[PDB]
Write an enzyme that holds these catalytic residues in place. Sequence first.
Site, PDB file in Angstrom:
ATOM      1  N   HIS A   1      -3.615  12.285  10.213  1.00  0.00           N
ATOM      2  CA  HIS A   1      -1.932  12.025  10.231  1.00  0.00           C
ATOM      3  C   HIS A   1      -0.849  13.192  10.455  1.00  0.00           C
ATOM      4  CE1 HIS A   1       1.989  10.859   8.141  1.00  0.00           C
ATOM      5  NE2 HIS A   1       1.875   9.587   9.084  1.00  0.00           N
TER       6      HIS A   1
ATOM      7  N   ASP B   1       2.127   6.168  11.071  1.00  0.00           N
ATOM      8  CA  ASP B   1       2.381   6.160   9.650  1.00  0.00           C
ATOM      9  C   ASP B   1       1.773   4.493   8.491  1.00  0.00           C
ATOM     10  OD1 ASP B   1       3.597   7.779   8.780  1.00  0.00           O
ATOM     11  OD2 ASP B   1       6.086   6.891   9.099  1.00  0.00           O
TER      12      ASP B   1
END
Length: 123
Positions: free
Chosen positions: A46, A91
């Site tokens: 991420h 996300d």
Amino acid sequence: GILELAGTVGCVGPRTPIAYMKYGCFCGLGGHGQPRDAIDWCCHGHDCCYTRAEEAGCSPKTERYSWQCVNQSVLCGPAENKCQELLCKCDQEIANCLAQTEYNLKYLFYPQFLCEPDSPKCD
Ligand SMILES: [Ca+2]
């Protein structure tokens, strides 16, 4: 933005998004070293995604985007611009990655100074 990030993670996973605010070497601001476990690896990927986004002129912490939670799955609506598409993808990816992980309390609030100097490269 942080709102969408928290929401997406909450949408798919079995635990509060806050559980990853400071976990391992990568969940939380910045991050370096050896990802401590599966969850930490999700945060590393991420961090990589957000970096690519930042280099593209996006604002990961505040750029809003449209999405929907249906049956505990994140649906990224038709993106208007590239940044909205990218961030939702980032996300959505971490939310899915974290969903089937086991939580290890030993890494909650893990001291960042214990994290090694060298980190895994980004895809
Ligand atoms: Ca991080």
